Ligand binder design. Structure first.
Ligand code: FE
Ligand code: FE
Ligand code: MN
Ligand code: MN
Lengths: 249, 249
């Protein structure tokens, strides 16, 4: 048996990431797949990169926030738009601890990977195979779009992140489509589910006979500590980060 | 923390059910939810009822196959229709061990119930709330139909069975929709995943903070022993049962 932890949409959430990695370590996880959206708009910088450096990371794909960071530091974002100015402040925040050379490394990642596990082809991407941004694959996404994860090129199991929701569904051909959700910014549209903003990730176990387990986990972390950390660090847009971690909007 | 095993679509697969019950016991499962399709076309009769009756079953709903066994033992089937001929033979097989008192108990079950875990409302049915049969809720089903599980009446998490596939997806309103797949007749349209016909079930974990785990498990069982059991007991339509357990079509 190989036990793989899927890690997605960390978003600089230091305390939530530490808690998930402790959980994963306890469970005897063998390897880690990284689905992107690593840094921003959360607290962690050097800390996130160092935590990940310690891991047996055997697959990594490019998230749209890594592009954003890259464009942000190169001064390639539109200063007219408020949403972009918000991004600029996050990029500048990140730059205080992270070198341009490291941002180059984060940016130089494939959109899509494929691994073989015995009989099974596994596709891996942040969002779509050739597009790491957008809303094609939200919870009500068109089947045409989901099938893009599992055909041309084909796989039997696609894993993706980006939407910040846990998922197990199917391509038209019965190919598995899974999403670990988000470590740092779990997204809920149901108000009761939204009261529980513990971190999200998932574990895949492959054995001699195929896929033996798909475990969608929630991990408790200390929100107060993460928020205090944000205050101490002078994280930009504290009020937004507070809403996301406390209220989930 | 309360740990709940979702058991569905057993279809009289004695060996697969026994392995699933052993697995669940080892994990320290606290309650069992029986989603229906209990007996036929597989081997188990008395033994399956004996097993179930040892369980703390805290939720139970009616599957279409419980209806089929009812009409079947009431002499309402016409064997000039191949579909019904097959069903009647399965019913006769079942009738060598199972009394009409027991079939009545199997038949006297609600289509849809609800359970509450703190803030969360969970809906339970075999298929649709008012209809334990059909193809509305297949892997390519319409969003309108999935919404039937979570609205009118409302719940935050719907669980259903019937389609013989593991599932985690969403109501339009972000409500969760989960399916443990099938214990005795797992179903795959992807030929690589079809090479692995281990029993499907799933575990839900609820704690003080809400839903903390969704574990979609596969459990190995002795296929040769269940086919040897089928031969020994003179199970009707052996090659159809063989084909489902070995090839998955
Ligand atoms: Fe993200
Ligand atoms: Fe069934
Ligand atoms: Mn993203
Ligand atoms: Mn059914």
């Amino acid at each position: 048996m190989t036990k793989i932890a899927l890690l997605s949409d960390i978003h600089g959430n230091t305390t939530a990431l530490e808690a998930v990695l402790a959980d994963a370590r306890q469970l005897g996880v063998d390897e880690y797949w990284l689905l992107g959206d690593i840094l921003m708009p959360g607290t962690g910088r050097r800390r996130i990169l160092d935590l990940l450096d310690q891991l047996p990371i055997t697959a990594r794909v490019l998230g749209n926030w890594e592009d954003s960071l890259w464009h942000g530091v190169r001064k390639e974002l539109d200063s007219t738009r408020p949403s972009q100015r918000y991004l600029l402040r996050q990029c500048q925040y990140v730059l205080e601890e992270i070198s341009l050379e490291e941002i180059e490394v984060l940016h130089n990642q494939p959109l899509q990977i494929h691994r073989q596990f015995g009989d099974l082809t596994v596709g891996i991407s942040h969002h779509l195979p050739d597009k790491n941004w957008g809303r094609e694959l939200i919870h009500t996404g068109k089947q045409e779009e989901f099938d893009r994860l599992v055909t041309h090129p084909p796989c039997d199991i696609a894993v993706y992140g980006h939407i910040h929701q846990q998922l197990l569904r199917y391509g038209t051909g019965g190919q598995l489509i899974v999403n670990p959700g988000s470590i740092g910014q779990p997204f809920f549209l149901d108000a009761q589910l939204r009261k529980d903003l513990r971190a999200q990730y998932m574990i895949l176990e492959f054995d001699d006979k195929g896929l033996v387990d798909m475990d969608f986990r929630r991990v408790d972390y200390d929100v107060a500590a993460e928020l205090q950390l944000a205050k101490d660090l002078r994280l930009p847009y504290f009020e937004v980060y507070y809403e996301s971690l406390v209220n989930g909007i």
